[PDB]
RNA sequence: CAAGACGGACCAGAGCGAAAGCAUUUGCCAAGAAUGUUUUCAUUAAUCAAGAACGAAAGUCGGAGGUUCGAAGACGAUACCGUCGUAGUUCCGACCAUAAACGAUGCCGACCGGCGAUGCGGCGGCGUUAUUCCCAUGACCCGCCGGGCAGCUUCCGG
RNA sequence: AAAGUUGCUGCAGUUAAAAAGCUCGUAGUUGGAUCU
């Protein structure tokens, strides 16, 4: 982000990137997000350009960090595949989560006992989140969004152009986030990599965690 | 959408437009040498000829025209022009 | 706007939004303005700085908002220019 | 009074000055104590029209009442209010609460030399609704309002003072009319004018600049 | 013998053929039908129930997440292969089986993908279905301790270990051949054959490819060389903004003629 | 065997025509849109008062033929229905000029979101097929351009 | 005058009154760019 030689993409990311399957998008394209595609391989799944995803990234990291007070950023999930991942999210900065089923009048109704007054939204998945979108649009809230290719662009006004439906790519791309505002914020440093490894963030299936103790 | 030089579009959208709906219109089409192989000389074809064109020495058939491209015989060699 | 006497007589100025030039309305609620953060050239580092766009509601609506920052962050050199 | 939002919040105590400046950043206004606060000394009120329409069941029709009032300070805010209640008070106060949350400010320009204070529409606008059109009009010092009387309620509790008005569609539906000269002085505000070129400068949003108060 | 759940769904009456049936508790307690909980009051209990021990349980857990059959088969499948592994670790010396599984090897196919093949109803030139063979058409059919499993993950990873898995005939198997889902995305396979999106890059993206192992640990694995099933043809088509009855319309494209007086929902 | 009729299925989100309308094969006749064009002329154009050409079905004059159906009508039952059945339905030559003759929606031109299906023409390209066809061509596959018929989606705006 | 219900300013013609069945066509109306 401004060619700057310190803030580019690296082997280890690529690798880690090509790993978690985040490149590989969904079988219809949107026409506001055709400039995250490289191309159309014949196998009729489009791939999404890494470095336009970082910058977008770099982007949304420095639209985070320019708000001084980390507890009134709302992150939100409602799909179980980042759930758990935007809990560990607040466990970065303190962002309050909201994960599971979206409680209407949350930003609109005042007289609730669940009614938060943000100042960024971030959303896992732009289509079940329809109804947070719709309420951001009421209250002056600007957006971050994880976008696949198939995800509409409406009240979006940064959308990381990634794979969200798998539970890996998802993680992996909130653990992306959360190292570059925990980086730039002031915790950490460059020269070394961040402890929590990748995994960590990742949704873990029932029927995977019944046979993963079993492994001890 | 709401930003883009239309004074300075990509040569591969120019390429990709319609030849009148470009910026500058322009033809799709060329000239170009055609050698006979039962000779050596050198004989002016337009591509999407309509006329079927002779061999000034040899009297043979050179190309023959189609709905668009105009089709060469077998065995002459071509080679675009300018 | 101001009179002849050269004094300011209005209410207050409106936001223009920074992607098409338009007037922000004071019941536009889904209008935003919204603020990127710089780094040090050197180290990276949020030295505390800012910069500020505001995107009117009709740019939104239309799903041209991220277009319209995009172009802003490289107008202001934060996207680099290898795009 | 307790406030439950955070520009309630800031209106309580003493950190925000005027309307104006929730005014420039499109905020929205949730509770009418703000207004009360800040400019409820000199509003007038006004009720314009009252309704019963019948909602038939089983057990007859059910009566509700459509209350139509209008309120503003003569000065440049203005709002409208419409509610159905189940009797007559309680839909004159709460059709005053929601006129109270609805109160969009009026900008006033001059008809030519540009002497005193500004005076009328600064530009020929029109309001639409349902199939009532309103059309506003400059009008010299000392013309009064010419109007019919619901728009001659609304702009004189706007601070027009003079006005020329011109009017197509169903006028005789109040409800639509009085709407109608509602979006008409709502578009006198929202028009763009050769004074208003000058490059935006942005200012710290109140928020962002009381943002050591919510964390307290 | 370790009888699998399959077989008791199956009401395989195997108990007079072998000696050693020991099975765990939760893939019986698990059955969520009433005639074989009904059938399991009557047969005579010479049924007994342990839990294998951690170590084997977990190298059992490595070989399968190395033979890539890893998220098809669940925990109670982990405990028969794990009991089935010590019954044969405790009545035969544990040098017979080997690890590092063999890397499969590539052969193309022109057929189709949804071809019938070794579907007994069909005829493909003879061909004949009779009644005396209905209990003889349960699967592609062919000392001291055996497997009664049916699902084919376990019978997979059985023959790709070397461990000799029987049926509910008296003969073993030879050959075992059936149908999963790759992955074209991120080539990721799946063996659960009612599954419609991926498990890693989690796209609709799965299709039918079929597979094949023997007794010998060698495993070959069909593709189709078939550019019908691999084209993006139906697939971009505008979305509105936000069971098994009518699956064929469902099949075809969006943007294709429909008739003008019927709707789509 | 003959008589006249009518061209099923294929037959469609299809095609053609100024509309009304048009479906068995083959041959002849003259038109035609779109496409392709580094051809030719150089404003020759758009719209319609007057005026002219065609115009479903029914109907009217004259010739031919009447298979089926069938207004009116004769019987039998209960305006409905059945049996028989005239004009007509059919061809040729003249009249008639009317339809829910519909998109209940002038004509020409410009701008204003997206998608992928389809009919035709042109262009580019891995590749498969005429039992691994030994170069081209037809049939498919991918992509683009132009004029079309026609869908889905959108808080473009109305 | 209200009547933008005679509309040049300034109305309308899918479903409310309303676009000729279709095409050609003189009069009339309108007519690409270009010359210091
Ligand atoms: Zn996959």
């Not at chain 1, 909201?98 to 009048?105: H, Q, S, W």
């Not at chain 4, 008409?184 to 935006?200: G, M």
């Amino acid at each position: 982000s401004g060619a700057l030689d310190v803030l580019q993409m690296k082997e280890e990311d690529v690798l880690k990137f090509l790993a978690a399957g985040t490149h590989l998008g969904g079988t219809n394209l949107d026409f506001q997000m055709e400039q995250y595609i490289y191309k159309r391989k014949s196998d009729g799944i489009y791939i999404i350009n890494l470095k336009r995803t970082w910058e977008k990234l770099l982007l949304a990291a420095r639209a985070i960090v320019a708000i001084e007070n980390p507890a009134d950023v709302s992150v939100i999930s409602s799909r179980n595949t980042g759930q758990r991942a935007v809990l560990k999210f607040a466990a970065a900065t303190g962002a309050t989560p909201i994960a599971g089923r979206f409680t209407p009048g949350t930003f609109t109704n005042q007289i609730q006992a669940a009614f938060r007054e943000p100042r960024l939204l971030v959303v896992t998945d732009p289509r079940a989140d329809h109804q947070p979108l719709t309420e951001a649009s009421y209250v002056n809230l600007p957006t971050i969004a994880l976008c696949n290719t198939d995800s509409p662009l409406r009240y979006v006004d940064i959308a990381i152009p990634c794979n969200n439906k798998g539970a890996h790519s998802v993680g992996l791309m909130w653990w992306m986030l959360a190292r570059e505002v925990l980086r730039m914020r002031g915790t950490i440093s460059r020269e070394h990599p961040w402890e929590v490894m990748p995994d960590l963030y990742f949704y873990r299936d029932p029927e995977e965690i019944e046979k993963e103790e079993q492994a001890a | 959408p709401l930003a883009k030089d239309l004074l300075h579009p990509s040569p591969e959208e120019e390429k990709r437009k319609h030849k009148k709906k470009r910026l500058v219109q322009s033809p799709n089409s060329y000239f170009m040498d055609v050698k006979c192989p039962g000779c050596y000389k050198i004989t002016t074809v337009f591509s999407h000829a309509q006329t079927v064109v002779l061999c000034v020495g040899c009297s043979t058939v050179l190309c023959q025209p189609t709905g668009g491209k105009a089709r060469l015989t077998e065995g002459c060699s071509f080679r675009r022009k300018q | 706007m101001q009179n002849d006497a050269g004094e300011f007589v209005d209410l207050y100025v409106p936001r223009k939004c920074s992607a098409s030039n338009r007037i922000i309305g004071a019941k536009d609620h889904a209008s935003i303005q919204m603020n990127v953060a710089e780094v040090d050239k050197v180290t990276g580092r949020f030295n505390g700085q800012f910069k500020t766009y505001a995107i009117c509601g009709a740019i939104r609506r239309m799903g041209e908002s991220d277009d319209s920052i995009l172009r802003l962050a490289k107008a202001d050199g934060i996207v680099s220019k290898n795009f | 009074w307790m406030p439950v939002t955070k520009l309630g919040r800031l209106v309580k105590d003493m950190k925000i000055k005027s309307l104006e400046e929730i005014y420039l950043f499109s905020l929205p206004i949730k509770e009418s104590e703000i207004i009360d606060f800040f400019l409820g000394a000199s509003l007038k009120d006004e009720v314009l029209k009252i309704m019963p329409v019948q909602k038939q069941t089983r057990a007859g029709q059910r009566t509700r009442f459509k209350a139509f009032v209008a309120i503003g300070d003569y000065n440049g805010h203005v709002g409208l209010g419409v509610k159905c209640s189940k009797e007559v008070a309680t839909a004159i106060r709460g059709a005053i609460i929601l006129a109270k949350l609805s109160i969009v400010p009026v900008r006033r320009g001059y008809w030519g030399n540009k002497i005193g204070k500004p005076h009328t529409v600064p530009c020929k606008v029109t309001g639409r609704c349902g199939s009532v059109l309103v059309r506003l009009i400059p009008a010299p010092r000392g013309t009064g309002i010419v109007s019919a009387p619901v728009p001659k309620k609304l702009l004189m509790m706007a601070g027009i003072d003079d006005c020329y008005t011109s009017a197509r569609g169903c006028t005789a539906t109040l409800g639509n009319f009085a709407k109608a000269t509602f979006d008409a002085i709502s578009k006198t505000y929202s028009y763009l004018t050769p004074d208003l070129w000058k490059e935006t400068v942005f200012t710290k949003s109140p928020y962002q600049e009381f943002t050591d108060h919510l964390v307290k | 013998v370790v009888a699998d759940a399959g077989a008791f769904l199956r009401h395989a009456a195997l108990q007079d053929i072998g000696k050693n049936i020991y099975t765990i508790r939760e893939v019986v307690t698990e059955i969520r039908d009433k005639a074989t909980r009904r059938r399991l009051a009557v047969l005579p209990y010479e049924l007994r129930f342990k839990e294998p021990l951690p170590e084997y349980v977990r190298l059992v857990t490595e070989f399968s997440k190395k033979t890539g059959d890893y998220p098809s088969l669940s925990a109670t499948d982990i405990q028969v292969l794990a009991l089935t592994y010590q019954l044969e670790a405790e009545f035969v010396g544990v040098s017979h089986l080997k690890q590092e599984p063999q890397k499969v090897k590539v052969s193309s196919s022109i057929q189709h993908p949804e071809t019938p093949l070794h579907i007994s109803g069909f005829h493909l030139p003879g061909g004949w279905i009779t009644p005396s063979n209905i209990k003889q058409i349960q699967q592609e059919l062919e000392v001291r301790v055996g497997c009664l499993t049916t699902d084919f993950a376990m019978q997979n990873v059985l023959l790709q270990m070397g461990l000799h898995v029987l049926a509910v005939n008296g003969m073993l198997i030879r050959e075992a051949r059936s149908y999963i889902l790759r992955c074209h995305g991120c080539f990721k396979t799946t063996s659960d054959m009612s599954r419609v999106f991926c498990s890693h890059c989690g796209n609709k993206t799965l299709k039918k490819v079929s597979v094949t192992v023997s007794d010998d640990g060698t495993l070959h694995m069909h593709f189709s060389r078939n550019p019908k099933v691999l084209n993006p043809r139906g697939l971009r088509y505008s979305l509105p903004t936000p069971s098994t009855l009518g699956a064929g319309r469902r099949r075809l494209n969006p943007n294709a003629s429909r008739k003008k007086f019927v709707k789509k929902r």
